[PDB]
Amino acid sequence: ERLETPSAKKLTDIGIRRIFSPEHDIFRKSVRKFFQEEVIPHHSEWEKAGEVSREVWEKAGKQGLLGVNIAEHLGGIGGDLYSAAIVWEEQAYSNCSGPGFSIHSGIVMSYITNHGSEEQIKHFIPQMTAGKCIGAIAMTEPGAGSDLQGIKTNAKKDGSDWILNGSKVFISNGSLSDVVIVVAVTNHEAPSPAHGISLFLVENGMKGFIKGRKLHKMGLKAQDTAELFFEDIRLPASALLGEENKGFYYIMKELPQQRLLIADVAISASEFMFEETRNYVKQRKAFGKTVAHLQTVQHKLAELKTHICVTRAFVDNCLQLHEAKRLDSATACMAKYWASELQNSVAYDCVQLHGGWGYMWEYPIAKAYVDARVQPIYGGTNEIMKELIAREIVF
Amino acid sequence: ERLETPSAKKLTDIGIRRIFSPEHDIFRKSVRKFFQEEVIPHHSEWEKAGEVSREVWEKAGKQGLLGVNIAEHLGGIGGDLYSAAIVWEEQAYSNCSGPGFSIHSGIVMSYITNHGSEEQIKHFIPQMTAGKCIGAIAMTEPGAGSDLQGIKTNAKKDGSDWILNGSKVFISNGSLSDVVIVVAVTNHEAPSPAHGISLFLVENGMKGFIKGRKLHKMGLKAQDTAELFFEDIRLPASALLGEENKGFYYIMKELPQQRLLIADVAISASEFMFEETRNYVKQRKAFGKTVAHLQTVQHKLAELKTHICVTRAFVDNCLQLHEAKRLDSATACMAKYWASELQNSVAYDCVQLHGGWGYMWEYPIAKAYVDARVQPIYGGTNEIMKELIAREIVF
Amino acid sequence: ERLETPSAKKLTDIGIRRIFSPEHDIFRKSVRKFFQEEVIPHHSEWEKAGEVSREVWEKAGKQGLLGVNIAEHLGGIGGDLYSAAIVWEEQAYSNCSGPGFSIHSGIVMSYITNHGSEEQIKHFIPQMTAGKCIGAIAMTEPGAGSDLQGIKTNAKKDGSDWILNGSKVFISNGSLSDVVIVVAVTNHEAPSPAHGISLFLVENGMKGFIKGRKLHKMGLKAQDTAELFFEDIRLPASALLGEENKGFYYIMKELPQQRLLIADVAISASEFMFEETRNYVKQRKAFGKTVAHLQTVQHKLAELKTHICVTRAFVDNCLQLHEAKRLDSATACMAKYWASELQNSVAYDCVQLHGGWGYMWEYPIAKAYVDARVQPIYGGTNEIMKELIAREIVF
Amino acid sequence: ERLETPSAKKLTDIGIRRIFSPEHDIFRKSVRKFFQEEVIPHHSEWEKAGEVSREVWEKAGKQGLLGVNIAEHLGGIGGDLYSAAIVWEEQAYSNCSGPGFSIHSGIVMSYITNHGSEEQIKHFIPQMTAGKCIGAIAMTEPGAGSDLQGIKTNAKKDGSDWILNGSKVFISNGSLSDVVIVVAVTNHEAPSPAHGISLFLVENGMKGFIKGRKLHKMGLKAQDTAELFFEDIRLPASALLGEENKGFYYIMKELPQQRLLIADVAISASEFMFEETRNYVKQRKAFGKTVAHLQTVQHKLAELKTHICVTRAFVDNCLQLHEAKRLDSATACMAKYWASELQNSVAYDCVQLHGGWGYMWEYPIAKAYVDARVQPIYGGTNEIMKELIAREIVFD
Ligand SMILES: Cc1cc2nc3c(=O)[nH]c(=O)nc-3n(C[C@H](O)[C@H](O)[C@H](O)COP(=O)(O)OP(=O)(O)OC[C@H]3O[C@@H](n4cnc5c(N)ncnc54)[C@H](O)[C@@H]3O)c2cc1C
Ligand SMILES: Cc1cc2nc3c(=O)[nH]c(=O)nc-3n(C[C@H](O)[C@H](O)[C@H](O)COP(=O)(O)OP(=O)(O)OC[C@H]3O[C@@H](n4cnc5c(N)ncnc54)[C@H](O)[C@@H]3O)c2cc1C
Ligand SMILES: Cc1cc2nc3c(=O)[nH]c(=O)nc-3n(C[C@H](O)[C@H](O)[C@H](O)COP(=O)(O)OP(=O)(O)OC[C@H]3O[C@@H](n4cnc5c(N)ncnc54)[C@H](O)[C@@H]3O)c2cc1C
Ligand SMILES: Cc1cc2nc3c(=O)[nH]c(=O)nc-3n(C[C@H](O)[C@H](O)[C@H](O)COP(=O)(O)OP(=O)(O)OC[C@H]3O[C@@H](n4cnc5c(N)ncnc54)[C@H](O)[C@@H]3O)c2cc1C
Ligand SMILES: CCCCCCCCCCCC(=O)O
Ligand SMILES: CCCCCCCCCCCC(=O)O
Ligand SMILES: CCCCCCCCCCCC(=O)O
Ligand SMILES: CCCCCCCCCCCC(=O)O
């Protein structure tokens, strides 16, 4: 009944890929409509402002695009992993990297609902599903980003409170965030920092919580990445997320999802770029016929489509495993690493096929190129992905 | 209940991969035992001889390894495509490329049962399933392989018999074949040679049918490959396979299975090489530790394992599609091309990891390296695969 | 005597490479000071402005960095090719791509003093060497860049004047230019586009000459690139550069220098990126020790340094050949193609070695990454380079 | 007044590349003639025997191909480094990896003349220059090839004699060698073998010296590679090459020439494959034209030609530096590593361009493919090459 991407008219067609159902296709169509009409037309302006509007967040919240795979009885929408993936994919197909929906719904809401108390869940989830409370997660610091145990941010108890001090960097949704999950060292006496880390829900408005100026980056112009500062912030007992000192444990449990998320975003962006480029060369007149008639272009496009389809098959297998809660760390790392790498190889060749116009911001491929470059870096660099993958091979 | 290759203890473990059932596992174990006892111990001798014995072929037929996925009511063993794939895979896992079982079972027996008459099927299939009648297919000629329009071998109608003249090169199982499917032009006056070709079943013993000497090759030392010559062979009317002048149609229908076969053999060979090399470096002492303790080696193995697992996912997806009769030519070409390229990339890096010993015929990786080099060439060059894949992209 | 880049303390050290003299080093040192003191400190401002100041051009001219290798008695600065290259290289080593000096001096001024008259050489060369007259070169058009036959810009002659019409795209120095060498079709009923093309000097001010607004690109933020328009510009008889319909001949003779120029800039930017990155990883610590101590990082740096040094050797060989006026089109195409691809390969790996900081505009590697991507596109795409290189191989 | 490979009619043409002179071109034509007439016609037979004839060695000696760049007053032919390189290159252009000439002349004879005694030089060099005494060098052992400290072969002083025990593997010219420079531990009491290693001249015939049978390899079919065993061989004081415990110092001084040698052989092999393949596709008919008319084939050839030419330029700069005795270990490592890697990349693409025929031993490209695979491994693996190169990048 369903075709796989290689046989589809377009890698981005609706109604394809075996892991989806007819009900998923319907939802897919609506999400695609949302990005096409509510995101794509305002993106150029958000790029200029360096951030998206609160309006689109509330719009996404109203249409039900936030907290999709978060249990309904907890304040989420209640869909399965496949529905949540559709939202990641469609955003990638729109080539609009500004809105930080997936970090919000795929990571932050996930930590809160999986390890938060009943009161934290009741206080945050509905607001986040509505898109009125924007979430962010802050682990990385100026001195440590792959070496989590090297974290310096710290929190020390003062009765029932916690005095939080330190700073984070490269925080997505940094500017617009209303709630930020902060990783901090709570036990300087623990044997290893891995046994002395906790998670704290820091809210915009607490005294001492300062948001730095938006960072100037080579890409992701509309994503408000920023530095965060904590100045002797007195945090109520309710700010502590999960058990004290069990923070590393919670991060480890959530990592697999974060990696698969990045992986699907990466391969979806590649499918976008391929179709975008396919279209360009078949339209670009040259030597009387289209650039698409040149043999070298045809072989190049074949190479790109093959690698893209091969990788999508693996990512879809991972989405299936994760749905069944059977996707382990190593497999998640393979997907993240291989897909993020492919995304940059595809972007590079696709810009080339566009000639000079590929270097112009007017053309989508231009921003696809700079937006792609960040994927092999965040969420655990690919060097780290290979390290983790090698553990089961040699040890 | 079933792990995929990334999570298994070894990429070659039995009981892994969701496309197989526990009944397939029982069968795989038995086939693996067969190669371990009836092929591996005698392969060195066969390399020297330049061909395997008739004995192993008959043992294979008796044990039920030939004609798997060939209709039982047609004289085959029956069983699904997955069972047939298990035999391709296990031969790859044994690193013995001598026995030409794959071409015989997956191609020649296929052409006969799908497009042959009751008489032809009754005459060939049972003895082919028994391993007493070895099959080969001959399309390639000295003048051209990638140029189908350049076939010179021809058959002239003389009364009710066919007069066949010409020659073919690079024919696998060419030396010990008992029946060979020959592609020849039967209508030179046809608009397109694609509509003027026919298939003929030539048997060993006919007058005018001459087998040339075994060709000296860089690898596949035990695979008897040779040139064939047809000198005014008077073929009975029962030598024609299928309808006259529709040979191109039949070839086009079998190609997808041929490409998929090559793809699975390639990815399976890669999995063998990976585990073989993984084992070697964990055992090779160096600098007070094992080569496997070196970070560069760990990352190299991670890269290899990741790419192999990713391709395995696409190939398994292709097997599933083919089992459903839903695998088209373009997808088959993607698997053939991508897997055969990976196979050589893997072999190169695995030889490197063995150091000097990787150049010694004594070590399996050495013959794996030279054996791997033929895959990107036969069954349609990877260059031809790209042209075919590009066809749907631009037209 | 002198050391080559592999043996030097740093690839960018002054006093290395056999093709330079002690006198060249002194010039080198003074050129290095200029960029550090007059370019680097203000580049960020120009990036935001979208163009450099006319002041920096006058400072460059006054200091004798504009028009090197241009005959002194022609109003130039004199000096061999090695001196002109030093200015290209040092601008690369400063990682400041804003000022279009090399085009102005290495391209525009070369055309004027090689195929221009004394009335033109006397008029333009003096003020161009002073940085008061900024030149450009318009060849590429919206319809085609690579397909030379696709030129729509035509110059119908009227009496002794010429009626210029058409448009250009991607014109570097498009905003600051005071004189632009325009390529237009003069002889339409010409057999080949070699007997129908002419070079014109369109000075700023002539009616009908319309400069479009600066183009928004992914990189070269400080390089004013614009679209140029021509709506019936009456051109004097002196506006014609060289012989009518002889443009092709002029361009073909200058192309080598342009290719060598891009190649040296590409390889120099690679040497800069390497030393920048080598320094970064030696000062960055993680998981206990400096990133530079990781074996993977070490081998990566060894690969980068090796490829960079091998390519530098080729480029210097090309500078020598060009000095003796013996660099052909093919050899120059090899240099431009290989060095431009290597530059992006180096940039990618160097961004990865900086981790997240490599994505921040604050770090030089970030702008170096996006600035490098233009090289394989302009000055003739690398695809065109291969075509040209292939011509003598098969034809 | 000379063209660089990029501009020549063929990358293998005589009279090109700035480092050579018209005198060199004359010698070049002569050497090329030697391989076409005395080697090419018999290589197939040698591949089956797994070793070349002692006759081709003596013929090479008589025509002055052995000992080039080995001082004439020392028993060699003399000539500069460029002349010795011509012999390495021409053998590669012939696509005959059988004759172990380069090793014998560019390595073994070099050790002897650069660190041997006047007596050792008198006895060995003359007959080696004549091709009467074939040389081999043995460092690698069963359990250690990239690990120096792993060497187990050892020699103990017994009076003025040396007792040698151990074994080596992968020894080129192993079967027909008359003299072998053996690396052995002479002082394990030292902090590192870098100060406890000595070189010895082991000769065929000495009691206890055993040659193993020829090893079966994927390529280099006519190159007699073998393992060697030393069983309490009583070596006279004269067997010691150089000073006791200074072996490492000598090996260290010779490595750059060894790496440069492999480097030149690697890039030269690539030049041969390119022209061989270029010829094939221009001659191969397809679609009523030649495979060379396909745009993909043209671009692929341009890519190969460019990389080969870029690498040749670097290798020639290294030849010029070594001529002046100014070639660094790190620089020589860059050449050995980069050229051997490119050689295999070129081999792979060229086999592909030949279609099925590239898999047939009949065609030159097939043996060139398996012959190339050895280069990234011996003379120090490419991984070791990177390690050495990284030293000055990260430390100091
Ligand atoms: C735009 C953007 C958005 C991001 N969003 C978030 C976010 O929302 N929240 C958050 O907390 N962080 C986020 N990050 C930070 C990101 O996760 C880190 O940059 C990333 O984890 C890399 O850490 P680092 O920058 O400290 O690099 P480092 O850890 O310093 O690593 C630098 C280099 O050393 C290499 N290296 C280090 N260790 C090894 C090793 N063991 N083996 C081999 N190589 C190694 C790294 O791979 C890299 O090549 C984001 C970053 C960017 C750029
Ligand atoms: C920032 C920037 C600055 C520039 N500055 C100048 C300048 O100052 N003056 C000037 O005149 N130009 C300049 N250019 C323009 C530049 O020279 C052209 O963009 C370049 O020549 C490519 O032409 P195109 O963009 O039309 O690509 P196209 O010709 O459309 O090519 C598009 C794709 O088709 C491929 N293709 C086309 N022909 C072949 C072929 N025959 N074989 C295989 N593939 C082929 C191309 O390689 C590319 O992959 C600049 C460009 C940029 C981006
Ligand atoms: C045909 C042939 C001819 C030869 N001729 C000679 C000869 O005449 N005389 C002689 O003495 N030797 C010769 N050799 C031997 C050759 O020098 C060695 O095989 C080579 O140095 C590799 O050593 P090894 O085989 O012990 O591999 P090992 O040292 O075991 O290395 C195995 C793998 O580990 C890798 N590795 C080891 N160390 C590191 C590291 N530090 N970092 C990252 N990776 C590492 C190696 O690169 C390789 O990938 C020859 C070899 C062959 C194949
Ligand atoms: C060991 C071995 C076993 C084999 N077994 C069989 C068998 O049993 N029966 C049988 O019939 N055949 C068999 N073959 C033959 C094999 O199918 C052919 O060699 C293969 O199809 C390639 O054809 P060719 O060798 O004629 O190469 P050619 O067609 O000459 O191609 C030569 C080069 O040109 C390239 N080229 C051709 N067309 C294009 C294009 N249009 N665009 C770009 N590049 C192109 C090719 O890819 C290749 O790079 C086998 C081959 C080998 C080596
Ligand atoms: C380019 C838009 C990508 C949106 C999904 C990003 C998912 C990973 C976010 C960063 C996670 C981390 O680094 O902790
Ligand atoms: C390495 C052993 C592979 C055995 C299966 C080979 C299948 C393809 C055989 C050649 C088919 C053809 O080219 O017509
Ligand atoms: C990154 C700065 C490069 C400065 C030198 C550019 C030389 C080529 C300019 C474009 C030439 C052309 O496309 O006609
Ligand atoms: C293909 C023929 C190559 C001839 C030169 C080989 C040079 C390296 C020989 C082995 C050196 C060593 O491993 O000690």
Exposed / middle / buried, residue A309 (Cβ in 10 Å: 0-12, 13-18, 19+): buried
Q: Are D319 and D19 in contact (CB under 8 A)?
A: yes
Q: Whose CA is nearest to atom 45 of ligand 1?
A: A383
Beta-carbon contacts of C364 under 8 Å, excluding residues fewer than 6 positions away, are C95, C276
Q: Is the same domain home to A257 and A226?
A: no
Give the DSSP per-residue string, A87-144: HHHHHHHTT-----HHIIIIIIHHHHHHHS-HHHHHHHHHHHHTTSS-EEEE---SS-
The number of beta carbons lying within 10 Å of the beta carbon of residue A42 is: 18
What is the DSSP pairing of strand D135-138 with strand D179-185?
A: parallel
Considering the domain boundaries, does residue C3 fall inside one? no
Beta strand segments in chain D, E:
135-138, 154-158, 161-171, 179-185, 197-203, 209-214, 226-235, 240-241, 285-286, 289-290
Rounded Cα–Cα distance for residues C62 and C55 (Å): 11
Q: Are C224 and C174 in contact (CB under 8 A)?
A: yes
Beta-carbon contacts of A368 under 8 Å, excluding residues fewer than 6 positions away, are A95, A269, A272, A273, A276, A347, A350
Q: Is the same domain home to D239 and D264?
A: no
Q: If you measure from the C-alpha of residue B267 to the centroid of ligand 8, how many angstroms do you get, rounded to a whole number?
A: 34
Asked if B370 and D370 come within 8 Å (Cβ–Cβ), the reply is: yes
Q: Which chain D residues contact residue C389 at CB under 8 A?
A: 302, 305-306
* Closest listed residue to residue D329, CA positions, set D248, D247, D265, D254: D254
Q: Which of C82, C106, C132 is the last residue of a domain?
A: C132
Resolution to 1 decimal place, in Å = 2.0
Question: Does residue D172's CB lie within 6 angstroms of at least one atom of ligand 8?
Answer: yes
Asked if B360 and D216 come within 8 Å (Cβ–Cβ), the reply is: yes
Q: Helix and strand tally (H, E) in chain A?
A: 12, 10
Q: Which chain D residues contact residue C337 at CB under 8 A?
A: 306
Rounded Cα–Cα distance for residues B383 and D309 (Å): 25
* Domain total of chain C: 3
Q: Is the same domain home to A294 and A236?
A: no
Q: Which chain D residues contact residue B346 at CB under 8 A?
A: none
All partners of chain A with 3 or more CB pairs under 8 angstroms: B, C, D
Asked if A394 and B301 come within 8 Å (Cβ–Cβ), the reply is: yes
Sheet holding C240-241, edge to edge: C135-138, C179-185, C197-203, C240-241
Q: What is the CA radius of gyration of chain D?
A: 21
Residues with beta carbon inside 6 Å of ligand 6? B 97, 102-103, 137, 139, 172, 258, 261-262, 265, 371, 378-379
Considering the domain boundaries, does residue D12 fall inside one? no
**What are the helix (H) ranges across D324-358?**
329-353
The type of residue at B175 is S
| CATH number of the domain enclosing A292 | 1.20.140.10
Q: If you measure from the C-alpha of residue A276 to the centroid of ligand 2, how many angstroms do you get, rounded to a whole number?
A: 19
Considering the domain boundaries, does residue B13 fall inside one? no
Q: If you measure from the C-alpha of residue D378 to the centroid of ligand 8, how many angstroms do you get, rounded to a whole number?
A: 7
- What is the distance in angstroms between the Cα of C343 and the nearest Cα belonging to chain B? 24
Rounded Cα–Cα distance for residues C131 and C129 (Å): 6
Considering the domain boundaries, does residue B295 fall inside one? yes
Question: Which H, E and C letters describe B165-225, residue by residue?
Answer: EEEEEEEECCCCCCEEEEEEECCCCCCCHHHCEEEEEEECCCCCEEEEEECCECCCCCCCE
Question: Does residue C285's CB lie within 6 angstroms of at least one atom of ligand 1?
Answer: no
* Closest listed residue to residue C20, CA positions, set C28, C10, C32: C28
Q: Which chain B residues contact residue A309 at CB under 8 A?
A: 314, 331, 334
Q: Is the same domain home to B381 and B253?
A: yes
User: Which of A282, A289, A294 to mutate to test ligand 2, by most ligand atoms within 8 A of the CB atom?
Assistant: A294
Please compute, for residue C153, the number of CA atoms within 13 A of its CA located in the half-sphere on the CB side. Answer: 27
Q: Is the same domain home to A362 and A291?
A: yes
H or E element at residue D77: none
Among all bound ligands, the one having the nearest atom to the CA of A110 is 5
Considering the domain boundaries, does residue C320 fall inside one? yes
Q: Which of B133, B159, B190 is the last residue of a domain?
A: B133
DSSP D202: E
Provide the terminal-to-terminal Cα distance of chain D, rounded to the nearest Å. 43
All partners of chain D with 3 or more CB pairs under 8 angstroms: A, B, C
User: Which of C65, C103, C270 to mutate to test ligand 7, by most ligand atoms within 8 A of the CB atom?
Assistant: C103
Considering the domain boundaries, does residue C10 fall inside one? no
Q: Is the same domain home to A256 and A386?
A: yes
Q: Distance of CA C390 to CAs A303, B11, D280, D298, D343, Å? A: 22, 43, 15, 6, 20
Give the DSSP per-residue string, B306-333: HHHHHHHHHHHHHHHHHHTT---HHHHH
Please compute, for residue B307, the number of CA atoms within 13 A of its CA located in the half-sphere on the CB side. Answer: 22
Q: Which of D111, D133, D155 is the last residue of a domain?
A: D133
Question: Which H, E and C letters describe A296-314, residue by residue?
Answer: HHHHHHHHHHHHHHHHHHH
Q: Is the same domain home to B309 and B321?
A: yes
**What are the helix (H) ranges across chain B?**
22-34, 43-49, 54-63, 81-94, 101-102, 109-115, 118-129, 247-283, 295-323, 329-354, 364-372, 382-394
Question: Does residue D249's CB lie within 6 angstroms of at least one atom of ligand 8?
Answer: no
Q: Is the same domain home to D169 and D227?
A: yes
Task: Choose, out of A95, A139, A217, A218, the residue to mutate when testing the contact with C (most C CBs < 10 Å).
Answer: A218
| CATH number of the domain enclosing D180 | 2.40.110.10
- What is the distance in angstroms between the Cα of C32 and the nearest Cα belonging to chain D? 23
The type of residue at A64 is G
Q: Are C224 and C51 in contact (CB under 8 A)?
A: yes
Q: Is the same domain home to B162 and B109?
A: no
Q: Which chain A residues contact residue D303 at CB under 8 A?
A: none
Q: Is the same domain home to C117 and C27?
A: yes
- How was this entry determined? X-ray
Q: If you measure from the C-alpha of residue B261 to the centroid of ligand 6, how many angstroms do you get, rounded to a whole number?
A: 8
Among all bound ligands, the one having the nearest atom to the CA of C168 is 2
Considering the domain boundaries, does residue B389 fall inside one? yes
In ligand 1, the atom with minimum distance to the C-alpha of A374 is 53
Q: Is the same domain home to A258 and A291?
A: yes
β-strand partners of C78: C68, C70
| CATH number of the domain enclosing B27 | 1.10.540.10
Considering the domain boundaries, does residue C8 fall inside one? no
**What are the helix (H) ranges across B64-116?**
81-94, 101-102, 109-115
Rounded Cα–Cα distance for residues A44 and A68 (Å): 27
Q: Which chain B residues contact residue C294 at CB under 8 A?
A: 295
Its domain, for residue D355, covers: 249-394
Asked if C299 and B296 come within 8 Å (Cβ–Cβ), the reply is: yes
Exposed / middle / buried, residue C252 (Cβ in 10 Å: 0-12, 13-18, 19+): exposed
Give the dihedral sign, CA B233/B236/B237/B238: negative
Q: If you measure from the C-alpha of residue B120 to the centroid of ligand 6, how many angstroms do you get, rounded to a whole number?
A: 23
Q: B with C: how many residue pairs have Cβ under 8 Å apart?
A: 8
DSSP B344: H
Rounded Cα–Cα distance for residues C383 and C376 (Å): 9
Chain-centroid distance of CA A369 in Å reads 17
* Closest listed residue to residue D344, CA positions, set D386, D312, D304: D304
Q: Which chain D residues contact residue A295 at CB under 8 A?
A: 294-296
Rounded Cα–Cα distance for residues B17 and B14 (Å): 9
Rounded Cα–Cα distance for residues D330 and D390 (Å): 9
SS3 D215: coil
Q: Is the same domain home to B190 and B303?
A: no
The type of residue at D210 is I
Q: A with C: how many residue pairs have Cβ under 8 Å apart?
A: 99
Among all bound ligands, the one having the nearest atom to the CA of A97 is 5
